[PDB]
Amino acid sequence: KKAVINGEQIRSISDLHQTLKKELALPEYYGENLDALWDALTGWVEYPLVLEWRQFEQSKQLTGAESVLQVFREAKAEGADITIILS
């Protein structure tokens, strides 16, 4: 399971959630909020997972991006097998 974020194509926080929804094969009821993201990383998503996040900074501008990244890191801290590549 590999998920790619093209940071330069993210024009809003909704864009980010929409990409995540597709890239992680999230549930159709996906809440598009940080609590919904946490729930999915810990009780939905398939592992091992590789998150490749390109142009992080552009996406940061546009959203946000940092809060979302932070959820991925806590999920990993807690043991989920997530590789994060920041290009």
């Binding site: 549930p27 919904a36 959820v71």
Partner: protein
């Protein structure tokens, strides 16, 4: 099987703990739960995920110094997880969400 908003909400307020059909995410995994397989009822028949800390990341539930939140799945029987959750505080405030944490309603 107590897994409805009111049955679990009443249970929490009466016994200050979740009903016996609940297990944490770590516990479940311990029995062989693989969220992407949707095999919880195969590995722990009659169980539902519940009891993990709820970090209230969007700050939608009321905070207070000393107050911690936890959550539990509601209306689950088998297969993949749904979008219903019960949220309960350490001082017994109870909220529910039916939309994957976009909105909450105070119920106790």
């Amino acid at each position: 099987v107590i897994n409805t908003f009111d049955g679990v909400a009443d249970y929490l307020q009466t016994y200050h703990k979740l009903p016996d059909n609940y297990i944490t995410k770590s516990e479940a995994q311990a029995l062989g739960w693989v969220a992407s397989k949707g095999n919880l009822a195969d590995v722990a028949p009659g169980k539902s995920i519940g009891g993990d800390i709820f970090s209230n990341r969007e700050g939608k539930l009321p905070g207070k110094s000393g107050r911690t939140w936890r959550e539990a799945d509601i209306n689950y029987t088998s297969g993949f997880r749904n979008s219903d959750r019960i949220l309960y505080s350490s001082d017994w405030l109870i909220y529910k969400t039916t939309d994957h944490y976009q909105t909450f309603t105070k119920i106790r």
